[PDB]
């Protein structure tokens, strides 16, 4: 792992949504693996794309509105 | 004059209606600003002093003084219509913002359309009476239209109360929905979206009612002719347009924005 | 009788003259906006101390020179003069409505100055982008009073549209069709058409900015699911089509300049000029996103753009091509109107040229937000509409006024201008290529030459101004009464004399089938 | 065009006062600002 | 109601030189000097606003 | 950077303002002949005292006005719309680096691997070292190794910004809640500027862009250092 | 006609309201209002609004609008 | 069931003074295009005015977006100076 | 309402330097305007 890949699902100069997706699909995999005791390893890939392409600012907003109940993506 | 254009006496109303715009903003930017009402309840004032007497004025020059030859007639049609259509590309600003929004609803919602949080009016219930109610206002006026063209005055009158009478029950179908909403114009872009664009289509029933009233007195006091009528003809080409931005609003917003 | 005559105006022709007057005043106000960006530029460094000032003093620039001057003159004052006289009408359709478009714009102007007055002003620039033109980045009261100098000034065009469109239709003699109208009543019903149609967006966008300020509403504001992009184009949807609104009635003023001083009964190609007018309003409407080029937009979407905004030279060269095959074989008078609109149909095509330029979304990267888009729009905009104004004003000052102008002064002042003009914006090519930000206080030591060039151009440019109010002080102070001009048969807005008569058309003319 | 000889002539000597006036109302006021930006 | 518009028009084309908008008599004076007097007023009042807000 | 006197762009330091470069040069050729030809057709209008004042017709002519233009215009297009093509050719980044604007100042963040960031603020001139540029120089420079394809994502904490670096062709607006993508790939080491390029308040002169290009060993020992 | 167009009032148009207002007074009880959750995209104040408190939308109604710290 | 006024009862002014000269098939207030004669010197254009001279406009071919204007007198016919046309003014 | 050269506009060319100095006034006044917004934001 360099750097996120090219995602034919995002092939635009806007790539807000490729970080929303990759947050909502490592939080949603984390959520599945826990939840039987499971592993989080298996979320890696989502967990170093979201880290790579989301602004830092973003992630600790979304971080925060989960601890607060306020977060509006379904996880 | 050997032509059969009107030249209209000097007048007043422009500057009293430019300076009623003066106050009216001037009283905007006063309210929010400067927690005062003061000058934009001046500035009403000035602007219902200023369209009474302009368009009471009109009334004078046509149906009293006879200026409202065959040529002025064909202007006045081309100047409403004209109006209308600069109404209509007012309203495409607000479904721009609308289509804009849902079709690409941003994170901060959800991803989603309604966003998060958002419970939205059962578009088959009081928002489906409104549509029924604004159709048959659009009959009802053509009825009137009809009646007025066949000579007939109680059936005229009788047309245009009910048409009146339909647009009061919009208005007031649409204030208690306001009132009885669980979203607010502070509900993010949903809020705005819903309440600017149903606002500014609320005023233009409640323009538009005005405007069927002043036809209702001038029919009671016998101005129309049979053949000339042209403030009912303006008043029913912007009560149609009225119907037909609430029917592009109740398909976008209330039912496929559900 | 005079505040009847001045302030209840029911007459095209007064109320022309006070547009004309509102224009030249606004003028005076847009140059010293002008002249205090130039001295901020003129060395490196501050001068104002209070780079805030500087940005109020771009935007009050450029919405008084838009709304406050070409308007004003071009459409306000050339349109009600001319149009009922070219069709022989006896005035507007909405001669008490025309008085209203008037009396709008100075309470309009009035709340622009209110904005610049009240806290620090709206630094906003023209585009009153949110989130700087927002209630966090511009608290205050600010923004808001250029929000409605906008509606005041947006409600004057919109009903200044109607009466020329319904004027036009429904004014002329019976056996004139539209094909027997000048040019100069085509290019105003084609500006009135773009003003009914594009003001509108733009007072439903400002609205909505109005709302986000303070009503909580979120269009623009991306915490609310809003988006600033939707400002940029409801704003665009009317900016593009605002700019040929500047310009169209300028064509319209050179086609019958050209045609004026060449001798001729006629423009070459009548029918094209009327189809190229139509073509430019209407592709007008569908390239707007070229303004957008920077802001993260889809390639398919920028080769759109690119590629419909290319179109749009295709008829304006059908009109340059056709001036010229006018000036062909003519008995050629080198009046100073003549200068003007010469000097028009040059700086209007170099600037037209480097518009296709910056229509390439790919250079446009590295052009966008220099100051070659700045150098663009000096060339076609500012000079386009400047000569056409200046040419318009001094081929038909005798017929307003009844008196002369003094030739060689006018052809001193034409000199002067196409001198400032040249040394002013030319090297703001330079500057862009070489990567100088629009919209800067000041700039790296590297831009300075160009940049203290410019600076000194824009004084050349004042001195003109200044000699202009004194050659129309001296054509009232010496009282030269007009007997006769040349070619009447074909100029119909000098048959009355100059000046007209209060009223002229009492009697219509006369025209069979 | 053509036109009746001025009913009021502005002499050389005229046109300088009236060329001088119109100067003066421009550069004085703008000049008394530009010269005390240091003093605001 | 009765059919008055014949009396109206008797009224309104009167040859006494009035404008359209004072040709209704005295109450026409009234509301326009009523009119005449808010707007010029307002604007006075706006003005002095103005002058308030341009100082902090 | 620019230099005293400058005509044109600065000095190409990627391949895609390589390309530019000659299509702004094929561009400007037609721009200087068109200008040309018109200016010169008015002086031979204007120097002639045979006169023809009859109606001509215009249908002829007027075949050759639409045609030649609609050719030329092709003929820009092409070019323009191969390089816009260019631009937008998926690529294999092998780094991602974000900047956040903010008035009046950028941040970046490297966070592929680590979670590195930093601050990047204007040197005011009263603090610059003798022979540093005024109103150009910043206290943290972006590092990024040369001669490799770098995914840049552009956004803002506040007003709208513009991330520029004139020399690499780029140019991206930062809109807050928006991730803007662009590409740049440096055929050079050195210092690249550039300046915000959307009117953002007072300080808009004063939040300029400073890349650092290196080769990739000299990156990953500045990266490695930043633990 | 005026005949045609009043038959369509008073046998389509008014029995139409008639039967649309049958259904809204049918369905017109009072829904249970959802848990307040204190989402940020809602309830937003960027400036306080000029009637009231600065925090009541303009026709805030108990019941059903909470303020952005819940209901009242 | 009647009460609407018609036109007839109840238009006035101008627009009653139009109302009956186009009953009468007479157009004093200009709202038709008159039709040419032959514009020769013994069929001249008869160009009615209420005073002694009238605007002219010459449209002297079908489709010619060029009109000649030029003021008629009371008197001899004169000629439109683009086609010749004959024009004579008929107080 | 009066007509003619002079007649036809709300200011009077009756005597060349009054016109003069309403010219003066009157461009001078839009000229200067901007200068004293400057001073007036400046001042604060
Ligand atoms: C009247 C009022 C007063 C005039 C105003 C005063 C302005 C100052 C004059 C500028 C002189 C520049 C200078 O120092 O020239 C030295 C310069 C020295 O040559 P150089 O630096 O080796 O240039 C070679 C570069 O590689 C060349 O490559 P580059 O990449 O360095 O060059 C690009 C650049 C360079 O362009 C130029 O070389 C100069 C522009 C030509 C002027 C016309 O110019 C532009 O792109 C300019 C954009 C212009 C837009 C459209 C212009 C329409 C012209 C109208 C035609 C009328 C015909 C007459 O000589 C000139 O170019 C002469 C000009
Ligand atoms: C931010 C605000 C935006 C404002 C924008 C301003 C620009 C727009 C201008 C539009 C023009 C407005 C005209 C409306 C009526 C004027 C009212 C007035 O005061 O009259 C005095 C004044 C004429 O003075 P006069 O020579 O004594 O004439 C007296 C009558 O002949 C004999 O009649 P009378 O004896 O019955 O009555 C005359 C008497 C009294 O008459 C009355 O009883 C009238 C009372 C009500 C009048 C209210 C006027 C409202 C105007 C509002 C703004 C528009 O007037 C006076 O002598 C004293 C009045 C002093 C009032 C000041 C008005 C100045 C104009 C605006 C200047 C801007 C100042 C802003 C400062 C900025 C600070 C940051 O009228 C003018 O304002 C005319 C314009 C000034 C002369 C400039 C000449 C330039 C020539 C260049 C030619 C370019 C165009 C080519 C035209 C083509 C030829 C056909
Ligand atoms: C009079 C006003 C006016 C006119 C008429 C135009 C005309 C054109 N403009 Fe310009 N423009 C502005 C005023 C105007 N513009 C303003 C004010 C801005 C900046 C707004 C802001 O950001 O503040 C601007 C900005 C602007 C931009 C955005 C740049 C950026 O911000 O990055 C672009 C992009 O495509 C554009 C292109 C054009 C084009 C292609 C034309 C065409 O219509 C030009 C067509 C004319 C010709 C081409 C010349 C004549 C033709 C011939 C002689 C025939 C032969 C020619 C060829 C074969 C090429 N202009
Ligand atoms: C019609 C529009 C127009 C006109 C005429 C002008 C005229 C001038 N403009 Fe500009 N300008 C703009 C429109 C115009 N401008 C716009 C839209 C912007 C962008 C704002 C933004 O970024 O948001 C701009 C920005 C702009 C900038 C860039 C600021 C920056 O990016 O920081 C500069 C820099 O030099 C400039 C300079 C000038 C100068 C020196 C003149 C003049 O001094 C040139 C000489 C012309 C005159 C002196 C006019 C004379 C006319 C009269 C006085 C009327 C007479 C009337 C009658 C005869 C009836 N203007
Ligand atoms: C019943 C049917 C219709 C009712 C009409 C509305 C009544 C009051 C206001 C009148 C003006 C309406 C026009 C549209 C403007 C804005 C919002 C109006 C829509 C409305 O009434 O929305 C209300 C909010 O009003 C608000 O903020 C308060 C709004 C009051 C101040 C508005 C000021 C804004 C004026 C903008 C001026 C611009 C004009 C454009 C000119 C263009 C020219 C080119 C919604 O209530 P709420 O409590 O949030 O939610 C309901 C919860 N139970
Ligand atoms: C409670 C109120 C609060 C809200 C306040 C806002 C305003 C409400 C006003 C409603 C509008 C009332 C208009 C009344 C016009 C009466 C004059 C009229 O109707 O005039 C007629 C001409 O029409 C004409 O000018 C046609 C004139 C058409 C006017 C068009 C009106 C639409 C105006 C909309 C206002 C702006 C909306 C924008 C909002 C952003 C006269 O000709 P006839 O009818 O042929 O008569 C002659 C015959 O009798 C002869 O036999
Ligand atoms: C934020 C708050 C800012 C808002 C400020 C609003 C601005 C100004 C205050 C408005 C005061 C209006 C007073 C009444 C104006 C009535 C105009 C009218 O009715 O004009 C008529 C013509 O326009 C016609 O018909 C058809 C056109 C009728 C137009 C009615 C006026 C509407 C004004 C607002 C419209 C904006 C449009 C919305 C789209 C963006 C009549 O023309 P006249 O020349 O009078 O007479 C001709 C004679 O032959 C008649 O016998
Ligand atoms: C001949 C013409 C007659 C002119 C008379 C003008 C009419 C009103 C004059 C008094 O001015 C008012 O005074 C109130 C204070 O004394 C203000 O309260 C305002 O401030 C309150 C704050 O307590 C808020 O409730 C409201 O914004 C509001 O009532 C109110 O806004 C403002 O208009
Ligand atoms: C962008 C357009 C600007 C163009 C520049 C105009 C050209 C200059 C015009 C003259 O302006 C004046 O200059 C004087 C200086 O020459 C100033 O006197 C100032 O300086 C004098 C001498 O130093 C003192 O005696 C005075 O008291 C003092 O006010 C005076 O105020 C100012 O009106
Ligand atoms: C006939 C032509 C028209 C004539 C115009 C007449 C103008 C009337 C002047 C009234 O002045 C008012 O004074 C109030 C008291 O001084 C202000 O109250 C407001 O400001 C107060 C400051 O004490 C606050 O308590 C509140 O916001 C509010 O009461 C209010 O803004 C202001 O309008
Ligand atoms: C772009 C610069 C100038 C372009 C000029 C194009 C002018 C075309 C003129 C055509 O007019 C014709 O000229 C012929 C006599 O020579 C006539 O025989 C013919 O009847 C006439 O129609
Ligand atoms: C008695 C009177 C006659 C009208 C006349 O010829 O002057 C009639 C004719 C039409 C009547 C109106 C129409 O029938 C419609 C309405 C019917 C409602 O029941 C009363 C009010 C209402 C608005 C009526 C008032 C009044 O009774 C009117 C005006
Ligand atoms: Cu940040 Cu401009
Ligand atoms: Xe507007
Ligand atoms: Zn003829």
Request: with cysteine; proline share 6%.
């Amino acid at each position: 792992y360099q750097t996120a890949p090219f995602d034919s699902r995002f092939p635009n100069q806007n790539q807000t949504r490729n970080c929303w997706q990759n947050y909502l699909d490592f939080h949603r995999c984390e959520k599945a693996m826990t939840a039987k005791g499971g592993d989080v390893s298996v979320c890696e890939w989502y967990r170093r794309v979201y880290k790579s392409l989301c602004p830092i600012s973003w992630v600790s907003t979304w971080d925060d509105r989960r601890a607060e109940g306020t977060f509006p993506g379904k996880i | 004059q050997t032509h059969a254009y009107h030249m209209v006496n000097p007048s007043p109303w422009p500057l009293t209606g430019a300076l009623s715009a003066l106050l009216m903003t001037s009283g905007l930017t006063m309210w929010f600003h400067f927690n005062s009402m003061t000058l934009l309840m001046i500035g009403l004032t000035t602007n219902m002093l200023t369209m009474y007497q302009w368009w009471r004025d009109v009334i004078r020059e046509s149906t009293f003084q006879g200026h409202h030859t065959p040529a002025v007639q064909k202007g006045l049609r081309y100047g409403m219509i004209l109006f209308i259509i600069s109404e209509v590309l007012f309203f495409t600003g607000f479904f721009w913002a609308f289509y804009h929004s849902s079709l690409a609803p941003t994170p901060e919602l959800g991803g989603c359309w309604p966003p998060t949080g958002i419970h939205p009016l059962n578009p088959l219930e009081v928002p489906l009476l409104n549509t029924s109610v604004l159709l048959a206002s659009g009959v009802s006026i053509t009825w009137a239209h009809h009646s007025l063209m066949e000579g007939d005055r109680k059936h005229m009158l009788q047309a245009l109360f009910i048409t009146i009478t339909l647009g009061v029950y919009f208005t007031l179908l649409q204030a208690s929905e306001y009132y009885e909403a669980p979203f607010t114009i502070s509900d993010g872009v949903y809020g705005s979206t819903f309440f600017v664009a149903t606002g500014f289509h609320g005023l233009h029933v409640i323009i538009g009612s005005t405007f069927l009233i002043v036809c209702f007195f001038r029919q009671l006091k016998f101005h129309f002719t049979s053949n000339h009528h042209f403030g009912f003809e303006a008043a029913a080409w912007y009560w149609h347009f009225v119907d037909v931005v609430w029917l592009f609003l109740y398909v976008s917003i209330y039912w496929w924005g559900s | 009788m005079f505040i009847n005559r001045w302030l209840f105006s029911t007459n095209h022709k007064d109320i022309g003259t006070l547009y004309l007057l509102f224009g030249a005043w606004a003028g005076m106000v847009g140059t010293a906006l002008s002249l205090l960006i130039r001295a901020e530029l003129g060395q490196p460094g501050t001068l104002l101390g209070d780079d805030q000032i500087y940005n109020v003093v771009v935007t009050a620039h450029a919405f008084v020179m838009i709304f406050f001057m070409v308007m004003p003159i071009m459409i306000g004052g050339f349109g009600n003069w001319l149009v009922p006289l070219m069709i022989g009408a006896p005035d507007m359709a909405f001669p008490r409505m025309n008085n209203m478009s008037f009396w709008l714009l100075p309470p309009s102007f009035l709340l622009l100055l209110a904005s610049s007055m009240v806290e620090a002003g709206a630094g906003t620039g023209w585009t009153v982008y949110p989130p700087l033109a927002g209630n966090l980045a511009h608290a205050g009261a600010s923004v808001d009073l250029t929000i409605f100098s906008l509606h005041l000034a947006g409600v004057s065009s919109i009903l200044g549209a109607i009466n020329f469109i319904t004027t036009i239709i429904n004014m002329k003699p019976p056996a004139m069709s539209q094909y027997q109208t000048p040019l100069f009543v085509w290019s105003v019903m084609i500006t009135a058409v773009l003003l009914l149609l594009s003001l509108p967006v733009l007072a439903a966008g400002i609205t909505m900015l109005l709302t986000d300020r303070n009503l909580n509403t979120t269009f623009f504001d991306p915490a609310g699911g809003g988006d600033p992009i939707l400002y940029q184009h409801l704003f665009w949807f009317f900016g593009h089509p605002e700019v040929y609104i500047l310009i169209l009635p300028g064509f319209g003023m050179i086609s019958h300049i050209v045609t004026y001083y060449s001798g001729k009964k006629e423009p070459f190609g009548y029918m094209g000029m009327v189809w190229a007018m139509m073509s430019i309003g209407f592709l007008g409407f569908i390239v707007w996103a070229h303004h957008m080029f920077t802001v993260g937009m889809d390639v398919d979407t920028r080769a759109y753009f690119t590629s419909a905004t290319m179109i749009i030279a295709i008829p304006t060269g059908v009109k340059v091509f056709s001036w010229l095959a006018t000036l062909h074989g003519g008995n050629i008078k080198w009046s100073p109107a003549m200068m003007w609109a010469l000097g028009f149909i040059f700086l209007f095509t170099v600037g037209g040229l480097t518009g296709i330029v910056l229509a390439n979304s790919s250079l446009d990267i590295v052009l966008h937000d220099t100051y070659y888009v700045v150098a663009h729009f000096h060339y076609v905009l500012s000079m386009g509409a400047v000569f056409a104004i200046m040419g318009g004003f001094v081929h038909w000052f005798p017929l307003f006024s009844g008196y002369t102008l003094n030739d060689t002064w006018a052809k001193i002042h034409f000199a002067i201008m196409f001198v400032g003009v040249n040394m002013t914006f030319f090297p703001q090519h330079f500057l862009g290529l070489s990567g100088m930000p629009r919209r800067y206080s000041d700039y790296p030591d590297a831009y300075t030459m160009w940049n203290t060039i410019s600076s000194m151009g824009s004084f050349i440019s004042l001195t003109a101004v200044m000699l202009m109010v004194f050659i129309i002080w001296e054509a009232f102070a010496s009282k030269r009464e007009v007997l006769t001009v040349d070619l009447t048969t074909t100029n119909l807005e000098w048959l009355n004399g100059c000046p007209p008569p209060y009223h002229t058309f009492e009697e219509p003319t006369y025209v069979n089938l | 065009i053509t036109a009746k000889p001025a009913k009021t002539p502005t002499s050389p000597k005229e046109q300088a006062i009236g060329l001088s006036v119109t100067f003066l109302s421009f550069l004085l006021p703008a000049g008394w600002v530009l010269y005390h930006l240091d003093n605001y | 109601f009765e059919n008055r518009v014949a009396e109206k028009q008797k009224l309104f084309q009167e040859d006494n030189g009035l404008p359209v908008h004072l040709k209704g008599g005295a109450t026409d004076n009234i509301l326009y000097r009523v009119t005449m007097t808010l707007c010029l007023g307002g604007t006075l009042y706006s003005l002095y606003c103005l002058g308030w807000a341009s100082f902090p | 950077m620019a230099y005293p006197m400058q005509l044109g762009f600065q000095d190409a330091t990627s391949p895609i303002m390589e390309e530019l470069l000659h299509f702004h040069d094929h561009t400007l050729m037609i721009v200087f002949l068109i200008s040309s030809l018109v200016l010169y057709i008015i002086s031979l209008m204007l120097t002639t005292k045979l006169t023809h004042t009859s109606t001509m017709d215009a249908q002829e002519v007027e075949t050759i006005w639409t045609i030649l233009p609609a050719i030329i215009l092709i003929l820009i297009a092409l070019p323009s719309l191969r390089i816009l093509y260019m631009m937008d050719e998926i690529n294999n980044p092998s780094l991602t680096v974000k900047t956040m604007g903010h008035q009046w100042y950028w941040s970046y963040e490297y966070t592929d691997y680590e979670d590195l960031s930093f601050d990047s603020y204007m040197i005011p001139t009263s603090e610059l070292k003798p022979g540093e540029l005024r109103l150009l120089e910043v206290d943290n420079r972006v590092v990024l190794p040369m001669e490799m394809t770098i995914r840049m994502l552009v956004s803002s904490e506040d007003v709208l910004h513009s991330w520029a670096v004139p020399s690499l062709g780029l140019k991206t607006d930062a809109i807050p809640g928006r991730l803007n993508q662009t590409t740049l790939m440096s055929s050079r080491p050195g210092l690249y500027y550039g300046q915000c390029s959307e009117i953002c308040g007072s300080n808009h002169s004063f939040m300029p862009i400073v890349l650092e290009l290196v080769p990739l060993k000299y990156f990953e020992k500045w990266s490695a250092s930043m633990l | 006609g005026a005949r045609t167009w009043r038959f369509l009032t008073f046998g389509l148009a008014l029995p139409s309201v008639a039967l649309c207002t049958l259904n809204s007074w049918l369905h017109s009880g009072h829904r249970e209002r959802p848990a307040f959750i204190p989402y940020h995209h809602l309830r937003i104040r960027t400036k306080p609004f000029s009637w009231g408190d600065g925090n009541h939308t303009f026709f805030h109604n108990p019941r059903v609008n909470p303020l952005p710290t819940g209901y009242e | 069931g009647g009460g609407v006024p018609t036109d007839e009862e109840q238009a006035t002014g101008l627009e009653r003074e139009v109302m009956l000269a186009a009953r009468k098939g007479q157009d004093p207030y200009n709202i038709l295009a008159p039709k040419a004669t032959s514009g020769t010197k013994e069929d001249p254009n008869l160009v009615p005015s209420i005073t002694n001279k009238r605007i002219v406009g010459c449209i002297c071919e079908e489709d010619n977006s060029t009109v000649i204007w030029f003021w008629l007198h009371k008197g001899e016919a004169q000629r439109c100076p683009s086609c010749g046309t004959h024009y004579k003014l008929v107080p | 309402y009066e007509e003619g050269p002079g007649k036809n506009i709300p200011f009077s060319v009756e005597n060349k330097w009054r016109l003069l100095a309403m010219m003066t006034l009157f461009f001078g006044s839009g000229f200067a305007a901007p200068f004293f917004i400057v001073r007036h934001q400046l001042l604060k």
